Amino acid sequence: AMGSMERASLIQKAKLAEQAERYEDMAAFMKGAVEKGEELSCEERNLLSVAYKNVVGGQRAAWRVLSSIEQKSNEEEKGPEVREYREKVETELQGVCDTVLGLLDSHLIKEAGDAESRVFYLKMKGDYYRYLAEVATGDDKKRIIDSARSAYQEAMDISKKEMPPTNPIRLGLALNFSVFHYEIANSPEEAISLAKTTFDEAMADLHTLSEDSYKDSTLIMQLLRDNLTLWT
C-alpha cells in the first residue's frame, strides 16, 4: 500500500508517526521503506525496530491479560468468548511476527554484510521467533524455539568476533538471548551465566569509551543487572 510513496517520505513519516505515538502507522511506513529494496541505515534500522516492538508489545500485553483470564476460567463456565478473543489477539500477533520475519528473510538479512547490520537483523529474528514461542503450543513449538535459538546464536557468534563487549547491539542481543534462556528455553542457569559474563566483560571495556558511549553501554548493563537481581 506504500508502493507509490517515496522512500524518503516514508522515513520522514515514520519519524512523525513516532512523535505522534502512532506505532501501527510507523510500522507500515517502515515496512514500505524496507520494500523499496535498498539496505537500511543505522537510523532506519532503529525506526523499524521501534515501530514493530511497540506494535507487538501492545499485542503481547493484551495476550497476557486475556491468557490470564482464560486460565482462571479453567480452574463458572462463561462460554467460548474468552478463548475466542484470546485467539483473535494471538492470530494478529502471529501475523505481525510473520510480517517482520518476512521482511528479514526478503531480503534484509541476506544483503546485510557488515557486523552491525547483520547482528541487528539476527537479533530481530530471534526476538520475533521468541514472541511466536511465547504463544506457541502445537506441533511446531519446538521448531519455533529452535529458530529463535539459532538466530540468536548466529548473532552472538558474529558479535563476539566483530564487536567490542560494550557495543549496544551486542549488549542488547545478549540481554534478549538471556531472557530467551530464562523464559522460553527453561534454562535459568544459562540465562544467569550469560547475563553475568556479558555484564562483567562490558564493565572491563568501559574505560575505552567516550562519555556518550559510556552512557549508552551502562544503560543496557543496568537491564542485565536488573534481571540478575530478579533471578538470583
Partner: peptide, 7 residues
Amino acid sequence: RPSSWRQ
C-alpha cells in the same frame, strides 16, 4: 517477568 531490551 524480566526485562528484555527497551529504549
